Amino acid sequence: MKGYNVYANGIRQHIIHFPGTGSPLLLIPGITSPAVTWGFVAERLAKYFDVHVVDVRGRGLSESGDLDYSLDAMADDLVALAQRMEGVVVLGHAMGARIAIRAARKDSQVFSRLILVDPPVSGPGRRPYPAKWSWYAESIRLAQRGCTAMEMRSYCPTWTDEQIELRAEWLHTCQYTAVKTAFDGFHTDDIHTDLAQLTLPIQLVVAGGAEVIQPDDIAEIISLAPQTTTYVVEEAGHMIPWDNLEGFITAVSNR
Template sequence: MATGYNVNANGIRQHLIHHRGPHGAPQLLLVPGITSPAITWGFVGVELAKRFDVHILDVRGRGLSQAGDLDYTLDAMADDVIALARRMNRPVVLGHSMGARIAVRAAGKSSEPIAGVILVDPPVSGPNRRPYPAQWAWYGDSIRMAEQGCTADDMARFCPSWTEEQRALRAEWLHTCQWGAIRQAFDGFSTDDIHADMARLTLPARLVIAGGATVILPEDADEISRLMPQIEIRRVEGAGHMIPWDDLQGLLDAVLDFSA
C-alpha cells in the first residue's frame, strides 16, 4: 500500500509517496520530470517496490509539496534531493527527464548521502548545445488548461498515446504544477550545464535511453560515457521520452537489476 508523508527538508515542506519494498530492500528516491507529480508515477512505484523501498518526490512547486514564492532553479531542486537523501539510508536516486538532471546536479554537489544514480532519458541541452526537443507550449498550454479544469478527453491532444486512466490522472493533478516553477525549470534546460556535473560524478550510475525519442542521440551517449566511465547504458527500444507510459516492462527491465 502506498502512503503519503511530509517532511521539512532544505527549509521547505517536501511531500513524498512511499511504496514499501521488501524487508531490508535498498531505498530508492524517485525524482519525476518537469510536470509529473508523484502520484502520476504510482503505477511505476508499485513495480519498483518489488526490488526497492521506493519514495517518490513531489518536486517543489508540484503536487503536494510546498509551492509559491520559492527558488525553482536546478540548484535548489538538487539541494532538496541532497537534504532528503541525508534523512534516508543512502538511497539510489532515480530521476526521469528533469529529475535526472536534478540527480546529476545533486550527486555532483554532494555524493556522500547517495548510493548511486539512475538517469532516465535526461535532457542533455545546455549552454551552446542543441535545444531540448520539446516545445514550451506543450507544457504551458496544458497547465493553463488544467488550471481551468479539464478532462481525460481534453488531455488527449497533449498525450494521445496514453490510456484514458493515465490522461485522467494527469488532468486531475497537472494544475498543481505551478506555472512559474515549470517555466523556470524549462528555461534552465538551456542554461544549466549538467555535463560539468557529470565530470565530477564517480558514483555507480546507469543511463536509460528512450530508443524511440531524440532526447539522447548516440553522440550524446558517447559523451556521457567519456565523462562518466563507470556508467552502464540501457536502451528501451521503441519507447518515447515518457518511457514507462510507453513500455513499463522495458523500464523495469532496465532498472530493477541496478545495484550500488
C-alpha cells in the same frame, strides 16, 4: 501507498511511499509529473526497492509559491532528503535526472548510485531540448481552469484512460512559473560539467525511440563519467514507462 511530508531544505516536501523490503529508492520525476503520476511504475518497482516518490518543489503537494525553482535549489532539496536515508538509490526521470546529477555533484556521500532516465542533454552552447514549450504552457493553463480527461487526451493521446484522468486531475499542481523555470534550466544549466565530477555508480537509461539523447550524446556522457553503464529501451519514447512499462521495469531491475 502512503503519502507523507517532511521539512527539509527549509521547505515542505511531499513524498509518496510505496513500501518494499529492498534498498531505499528516491524517485525524482520529470518537469510536469507530480509523484502520484508515477504510482503505476512505483508499485512495480516496490517489488524490488523500498520506493519513495518525490513531489518536486512547485508540483503536487510540495511547497510552492515564490520559490527558487532552479536546478540548484531542487538539487539542494534532494541532498536534504537523502541525508535522512542510508545508502539511497536515486532514480531521476528527465528533469529529475538533471536534479540527480547536480545533487550528486553537491554531495555524493549521501547517495549510493544514480539511475538517470532520459535526461535532457541541453545546456549552454548545446543542442536545445526537442520539445515545444507551448505543449506545457497550454495544457497547464487548461488544467488550472479545470478540464476533463477527454480534454487532456489531446495532449497525451497515446496514454491509458487512467493515466490521462490522473493528469487532468493533477497537472494544475505544477506551478506555471516553476515549469517555465525548469524548461529554461534545460538550456541554462550545464549538467556536463557536473557529470565530469561524478565518481559514484551511474546507469544511464535511454529512450531509444526519442530524440532527447542521440548516440553521440551517450558517447559524451561516457567520456565525462567513464563508470557509466547504458541501457537503451529500444523504440521507446521519452516517457518510457508510459510507452513501454515492461521495458522500463526490465531496464531498472536485475541489473
